[PDB]
Every structure is written in structure tokens, then in C-alpha cells.
Scaffold this active site. Sequence first.
Site, PDB file in Angstrom:
ATOM      1  N   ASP A   1      -9.516 -11.233   8.718  1.00  0.00           N
ATOM      2  CA  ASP A   1      -8.299 -10.614   9.229  1.00  0.00           C
ATOM      3  C   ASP A   1      -8.662  -9.361  10.024  1.00  0.00           C
ATOM      4  O   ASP A   1      -8.163  -8.261   9.789  1.00  0.00           O
ATOM      5  CB  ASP A   1      -7.319 -10.298   8.103  1.00  0.00           C
ATOM      6  CG  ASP A   1      -5.912 -10.088   8.611  1.00  0.00           C
ATOM      7  OD1 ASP A   1      -5.576 -10.652   9.675  1.00  0.00           O
ATOM      8  OD2 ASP A   1      -5.149  -9.352   7.952  1.00  0.00           O
TER       9      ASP A   1
ATOM     10  N   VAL B   1       0.853  -1.178   0.000  1.00  0.00           N
ATOM     11  CA  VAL B   1       0.000   0.000   0.000  1.00  0.00           C
ATOM     12  C   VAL B   1       0.891   1.230   0.000  1.00  0.00           C
ATOM     13  O   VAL B   1       1.785   1.360   0.845  1.00  0.00           O
ATOM     14  CB  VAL B   1      -0.958   0.016   1.199  1.00  0.00           C
ATOM     15  CG1 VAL B   1      -1.978   1.110   0.996  1.00  0.00           C
ATOM     16  CG2 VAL B   1      -1.629  -1.342   1.348  1.00  0.00           C
TER      17      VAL B   1
ATOM     18  N   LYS C   1      -3.044   0.268  -3.542  1.00  0.00           N
ATOM     19  CA  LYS C   1      -2.618  -1.085  -3.235  1.00  0.00           C
ATOM     20  C   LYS C   1      -2.258  -1.813  -4.519  1.00  0.00           C
ATOM     21  O   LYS C   1      -3.002  -1.771  -5.502  1.00  0.00           O
ATOM     22  CB  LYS C   1      -3.707  -1.855  -2.484  1.00  0.00           C
ATOM     23  CG  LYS C   1      -3.335  -3.297  -2.163  1.00  0.00           C
ATOM     24  CD  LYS C   1      -4.183  -3.838  -1.024  1.00  0.00           C
ATOM     25  CE  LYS C   1      -4.684  -5.236  -1.322  1.00  0.00           C
ATOM     26  NZ  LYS C   1      -6.159  -5.269  -1.537  1.00  0.00           N
TER      27      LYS C   1
HETATM   28  O1  LIG Z   1      -6.244  -0.217   2.494  1.00  0.00           O
HETATM   29  C1  LIG Z   1      -5.429  -0.338   3.395  1.00  0.00           C
HETATM   30  N1  LIG Z   1      -5.024   0.695   4.174  1.00  0.00           N
HETATM   31  C2  LIG Z   1      -5.418   2.033   4.090  1.00  0.00           C
HETATM   32  C3  LIG Z   1      -6.331   2.624   3.267  1.00  0.00           C
HETATM   33  N2  LIG Z   1      -6.351   3.924   3.583  1.00  0.00           N
HETATM   34  N3  LIG Z   1      -5.479   4.207   4.578  1.00  0.00           N
HETATM   35  C4  LIG Z   1      -4.904   3.036   4.885  1.00  0.00           C
HETATM   36  C5  LIG Z   1      -3.887   2.937   5.944  1.00  0.00           C
HETATM   37  O2  LIG Z   1      -3.302   1.872   6.166  1.00  0.00           O
HETATM   38  N4  LIG Z   1      -3.636   4.033   6.655  1.00  0.00           N
HETATM   39  C6  LIG Z   1      -2.598   4.074   7.676  1.00  0.00           C
HETATM   40  C7  LIG Z   1      -3.196   4.132   9.074  1.00  0.00           C
HETATM   41  C8  LIG Z   1      -2.088   4.199  10.108  1.00  0.00           C
HETATM   42  N5  LIG Z   1      -1.199   5.342   9.860  1.00  0.00           N
HETATM   43  C9  LIG Z   1      -0.592   5.262   8.528  1.00  0.00           C
HETATM   44  C10 LIG Z   1      -1.664   5.254   7.459  1.00  0.00           C
HETATM   45  C11 LIG Z   1      -4.769  -1.635   3.679  1.00  0.00           C
HETATM   46  C12 LIG Z   1      -4.819  -2.693   2.776  1.00  0.00           C
HETATM   47  C13 LIG Z   1      -4.168  -3.857   3.101  1.00  0.00           C
HETATM   48  F1  LIG Z   1      -4.223  -4.889   2.222  1.00  0.00           F
HETATM   49  C14 LIG Z   1      -3.464  -4.040   4.262  1.00  0.00           C
HETATM   50  C15 LIG Z   1      -3.437  -2.972   5.121  1.00  0.00           C
HETATM   51  F2  LIG Z   1      -2.754  -3.108   6.286  1.00  0.00           F
HETATM   52  C16 LIG Z   1      -4.056  -1.775   4.866  1.00  0.00           C
END
Ligand SMILES: O=C(Nc1c[nH]nc1C(=O)NC1CCNCC1)c1cc(F)cc(F)c1
Length: 280
Positions: A112, A15, A30
Site C-alpha cells: 500500500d 489512528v 492505532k
Molecule cells: O501510522 C499511521 N500514521 C501515522 C503515524 N504517525 N503519524 C501518522 C500520520 O498519519 N500522521 C499524519 C500526517 C498528515 N497530517 C496529519 C498527521 C497510519 C497507519 C495506518 F494504518 C494508516 C494510515 F493512513 C496511517
Amino acid sequence: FEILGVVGEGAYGVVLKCRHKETHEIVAIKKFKEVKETTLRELKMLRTLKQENIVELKEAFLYLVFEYVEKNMLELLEEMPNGVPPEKVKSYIYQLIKAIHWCHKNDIVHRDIKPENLLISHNDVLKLCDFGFARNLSEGNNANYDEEVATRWYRSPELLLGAPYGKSVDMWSVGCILGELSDGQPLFPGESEIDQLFTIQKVLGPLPSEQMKLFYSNPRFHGLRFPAVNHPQSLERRYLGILNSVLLDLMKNLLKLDPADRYLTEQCLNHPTFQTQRLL
Ligand SMILES: O=C(Nc1c[nH]nc1C(=O)NC1CCNCC1)c1cc(F)cc(F)c1
């Protein structure tokens, strides 16, 4: 899209924190590292699963761009290490249950559910992410699990000892998160899966007979002692003075050792602890 950084990588792809060049919009893109778990399913699973507590697919172009949320629950629990305020425990778990409800109605088990995959908006709105590891209830017959150790800690005793995985195990994760939000501590931590069964039993008591039978029939645990517990410490004792008693009742129904007794989403939402939350 300019690249601003890496949000995360792990076992699900990558990501990237990116920004549209014309519009200064931080987005989370992603791509994988189709690829094992189909981005094609996800883009449709995220076409149905559009609701305020699930991550928004803003657009797609080979792959997927999401809304960017600055924080997740994992970061919250590091900054509030002794637990978040009690009102926030109820708000976040209510929003989490709502997102699971919308997943379970379309027969999608998330698979998950952990604090990393629970984003918290600037408006304190929880949003579930990372649907790559899921299984729909028809089709499926999948493995495609997240085998990270942190993910293990939110798994049912039945799933650890070898059972199929259904909606009831998603609810068990909700109960594990409820407790962790209340005091900041992982409810069932274990360096080894067997050490987890000690921590499950030390609070929820001796396991059902069907589960302890599958223990002695499984390759993974052969040759090792069972984590037996003489004098268990109940949830009531575990969260005494920490959790509102009405909320503790929801958690007890979330964490029934036997999957059959576990509350599913409709009972959780109609639970007493949400009465005033069911208006708001
Ligand atoms: O879509 C996903 N993540 C996200 C979408 N928008 N923001 C986030 C994100 O992770 N934001 C972080 C929050 C903590 N501080 C740093 C920014 C995603 C997809 C996966 F397959 C696995 C995963 F762990 C996350």
C-alpha cells in the site's frame, strides 16, 4: 493518554492523535475498526523493520502507539500542487527506496505504497507507515488489499489485470510517486481500472502480449472496449523539462510494463542519480 483528534480511519482501523499525560508527547495510536490483519504481525514486522525511513513503534499497550508525524506526502502535493523542488524529488524517492529495501530484504512487500502512507518529518525525513495491508513472501497467500481508488493508481498493470503481487509491483509504485512528486499530478489516474490502462498505455505504450491476453480472460473487464492508443507519449516527453534526465532513467526502469525488466531496490540505490545522495 489524552485524545487530541482523529488522524484517519479508512479501511485499516483508526489512528488517533493522542498525548501522554505525564510527558507532553504527541503519539499516533492505532486500533481497528487479530482484527482482520493482525496487529500481532505488525508489532513484529515493526520489530524487525526499524530504520530511519519506517515509522517507529514507540510502545504498545491491546494495540500500537507510533511516533506522530505532522505531515504526509499527500498534504505536500496539495500545498505544492505543481510538484516539490527537484532536489526533494530525489531525496524523498531515495529515502522511500531505502525503506522498501529494508522491507524487501526481510521478504515483506508493503502493498500500500501511496503518498498518504509516506510521512515527512520536520527534518524532511520520509517514513513509511501502514503495514496492515502487507504480505510476507512466505506464508501469505493473502488478499487483505487496500481497495481504495487512490491505492489503485499506484498498482502495476499486471496486478490490475490479475497477476500475483511481488517486489516488482512495490517498485512500480515508487515510479508512480517519482512522477507525481515532480509535477504534482497523478501519473496514471483512472476513475475506472480500464481507464487506467489507457493512461498507462498512453505513456508507456502498448502492453505486453501476456498482459493483453489476461485482459480477455478476466471476468472484470468482459463486455468493454480495450483502451487502445494510436500514438503514445513517452515518459521523456511526459516529463520533458520537469525531471532531471538521470532521475528520469531511474523512473523508466521503475516503470517497465513487463515486471521482469523492472529494477529492484539494489539497482535503484546504485543508480547514477543518487551518486552524491549516496554520501549525504
Ligand atoms: O501510522 C499511521 N500514521 C501515522 C503515524 N504517525 N503519524 C501518522 C500520520 O498519519 N500522521 C499524519 C500526517 C498528515 N497530517 C496529519 C498527521 C497510519 C497507519 C495506518 F494504518 C494508516 C494510515 F493512513 C496511517
